[PDB]
């Protein structure tokens, strides 16, 4: 009981999962609210992706770096390497104020490398020859004390992909619930599980059951529920065929007794919320500086999640209020747009032509003024 | 206007002429040129380095300025030159009375003191800070004069008192109370109050307010023992033990602003010395 002495006001939040650098779980077709007329006039100098595809979000380390920026207290639990990559990844997190006490480092396993058997004809690889460090975590190593202090747990479906790791994760979820925690599940379905809907619902049903708050992209909601898309997906107008609010009944099949809220996201363009007694949506901006490196829209995802976490954590009593939820949603849209913008400025643009730019040891990049040069 | 009392602004073209010998030395000392002839060439092409050297050379070297009809000593005074771009000499607003100068076509002359002995005399005996009193009767020569005076008057001018502020007699029927002066200055910025609006400020110090010798307008005395005394510009609350519990002053934001500047300047100079 060191709680009185050491807990502190911003409640601790714990993000569980894998630490990776630039990893995208999946990508699906999408639509965005944009000014079509500006785009025509500035055709020469603006990057507009030809077919727009949006990533659901990113790895859990990314969600944690984002909360820390907004002011939250965050910890990351997981396993990594003591190889150079690992040690460097821990430094990033540490410099960005994410507590790393919960991470555990191991000598034998490697940071992003998974030895795999060549497999049967048809190239069906077997990944069990040696597991990677990230998916190799054991029940014994979970840090109970961090779990005890925390009032929020965040996990993704990626950590449920490996068979041993699934077990570890479910235990962390159950330990937390008892001790007292709100569990937030972000279904960010990876590439393998898109083969068919039935298979997906069954894979994730146990997790869906244990969660107080869930976040699903619209495309995912349709895939799980059944609807097949009938939207143009490549046109120059905003028509309302896209951006639909599914009626409450279509969503009701998936509810369970412990679910307080469900958030469905169309990007920063629209965010929808469904609660047992009320339903609504808030609208936002997606016409943001986009570069070839940043077109995926992953950064916005991480930012939206972080805002929803900060707000729900600071005043816990109001998760189900109609007003609080609307204010939370607006703060989230703003955090997302700031993040996509910042990334573009940081990463830069790939050299258009006349690529005589100095090359960093691994790659080359230029500022926007430079991209927009005459020939 | 922005210059300090010890400084003057000298056009760069004038300076390069007056300080040339000094710059040539510098170019040679830093070995950026081989010979005197070599350097004079660098000065002509207006290369950027010549400018860094010029700035270095004039940093602690004073200069002398004079106006044409030199009626009295104050006609010549010394300043520390600051390089400026443009072709006119900038002068501090408060030194104009001594020089009898106005800004409608007047011109001035500059001289540079070459010897060490000469240079000491200028810094120590011919700078404005040292010569703030006129020779004839002892009066101040550098005092705020035109626009500056307008501003000071406006700050301290005051507020409408009776018929001007209220239409009907107050009988049939100001409010802000502030605890520290900083808060008051703040409200002015946030537009909560205006410059002339009356306010009450707590005073912890000792009755320094210049006011007439006037007895209290009303003394209100209560049975348990506290007495409140209302004078025109102040309220003094006292108790049975005859101790002054509180003093409050009726004033305007403008008055507090002048006091604060004079006080802060004194304290700042003190903390700098240390």
């Amino acid at each position: 009981e060191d709680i009185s002495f050491s807990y502190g006001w911003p409640p601790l939040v714990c993000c569980f999962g894998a630490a990776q650098h630039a990893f995208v779980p999946s990508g699906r077709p999408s639509n965005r609210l944009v000014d079509h007329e500006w785009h025509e006039r500035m055709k020469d100098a603006i990057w507009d992706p030809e077919k727009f595809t949006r990533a659901p979000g990113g790895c859990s380390s990314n969600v944690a770096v984002a909360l820390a920026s907004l002011g939250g207290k965050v910890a990351f639990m997981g396993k990594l390497g003591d190889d150079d990559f690992g040690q460097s990844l821990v430094y990033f997190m540490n410099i960005n104020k994410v507590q790393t006490r919960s991470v555990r480092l191991d000598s034998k396993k490697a940071t992003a490398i998974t030895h795999m058997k060549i497999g049967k004809r048809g190239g069906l690889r077997m990944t069990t020859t040696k597991p990677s460090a990230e998916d190799s975590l054991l029940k014994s190593e979970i840090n109970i004390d961090v779990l005890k202090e925390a009032k929020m747990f965040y996990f993704n479906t990626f950590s449920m992909l490996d068979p041993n790791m699934r077990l570890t994760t479910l235990r962390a979820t159950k330990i937390s619930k008892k001790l007292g925690g709100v569990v937030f599940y972000d279904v960010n379905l990876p590439f393998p599980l898109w083969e068919s809907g039935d298979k997906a619902k069954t894979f994730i049903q146990q997790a869906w059951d244990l969660a107080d708050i869930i976040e699903v992209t619209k495309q995912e909601l349709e895939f799980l529920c059944g609807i097949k898309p009938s939207e143009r997906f490549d046109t120059k107008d905003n028509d309302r065929s896209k951006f639909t609010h599914y009626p409450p009944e279509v969503i009701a099949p998936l509810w369970h007794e412990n679910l307080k809220v469900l958030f469905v996201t169309n990007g920063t363009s629209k965010i929808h919320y469904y609660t047992k007694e009320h339903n609504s949506a808030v609208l936002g901006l997606e016409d943001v500086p986009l570069t070839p490196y940043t077109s995926d829209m992953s950064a916005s995802g991480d930012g939206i999640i972080a805002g929803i976490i900060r707000m729900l954590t600071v005043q816990p009593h109001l998760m189900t209020d109609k007003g609080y939820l609307e204010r939370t949603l607006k703060y989230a849209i703003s955090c997302g747009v700031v993040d996509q913008w910042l990334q573009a400025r940081r990463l830069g643009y790939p050299p258009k032509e006349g690529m005589e730019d100095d090359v960093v040891p691994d790659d080359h990049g230029i500022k926007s003024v430079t991209e927009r040069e005459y020939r | 206007p922005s210059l300090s009392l010890h400084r003057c602004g000298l056009p760069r073209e004038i300076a390069i002429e007056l300080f040339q010998t000094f710059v040539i030395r510098g170019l040679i000392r830093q070995h950026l040129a081989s010979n005197i002839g070599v350097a004079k060439s660098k000065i002509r092409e207006k290369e950027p380095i010549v400018w860094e050297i010029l700035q270095e050379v004039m940093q602690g070297h004073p200069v002398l300025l004079n106006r044409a009809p030199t009626l009295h000593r104050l006609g010549i005074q010394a300043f520390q030159p600051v390089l400026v771009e443009g072709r006119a000499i900038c002068l501090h607003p408060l030194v104009c009375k001594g020089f009898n100068a106005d800004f409608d076509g007047d011109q001035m002359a500059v001289h540079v003191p070459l010897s060490l002995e000469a240079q000491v005399e200028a810094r120590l005996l011919m700078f404005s800070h040292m010569n703030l009193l006129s020779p004839a009767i002892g009066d101040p020569i550098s005092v705020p004069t035109q626009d500056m005076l307008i501003g000071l008057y406006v700050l301290t001018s005051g507020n409408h008192r009776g018929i001007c502020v209220n239409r009907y007699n107050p009988c049939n029927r100001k409010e802000p109370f502030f605890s520290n002066s900083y808060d008051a200055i703040g409200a002015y910025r946030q537009k909560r109050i205006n410059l002339d609006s009356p306010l009450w400020l707590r005073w912890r110090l000792d009755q320094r307010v210049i006011a007439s010798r006037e007895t209290p307008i009303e003394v209100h005395y209560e049975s348990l023992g506290t007495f409140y005394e209302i004078y025109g510009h102040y309220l003094i609350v006292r108790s049975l033990k005859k101790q002054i519990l509180f003093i409050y002053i009726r004033t305007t934001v403008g008055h507090i602003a002048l006091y604060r500047e004079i006080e802060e300047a004194i304290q700042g100079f003190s903390r700098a010395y240390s």
Binding site: - | P1, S4, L5, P93, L94, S128, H129, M130, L132, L133, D139, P140, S142, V143, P144, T145, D147, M148, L149, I150, G151, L152, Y153, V154, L155, T156, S157, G158, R208, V209, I210, A211, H233, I249, T251, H255, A257, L258, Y259, E261, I262, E263, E264, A265, I266, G268, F269
Partner: protein, 45 residues
């Protein structure tokens, strides 16, 4: 340690004050006071 003034300042009054400040604090302090009052005057005007 200075007086608090609750009435207007005109040119005669400023000369009297600069004189009084020169005697109490000296020419160095007075020069700084003077530069600061100038700034305030220009700003308000």
């Amino acid at each position: 340690n200075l007086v608090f003034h609750n009435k207007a300042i005109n040119g005669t009054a400023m000369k009297r004050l600069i004189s009084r400040l020169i005697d109490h604090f000296g020419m160095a302090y007075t020069s700084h006071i003077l530069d600061q009052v100038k700034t305030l005057g220009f700003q308000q005007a």
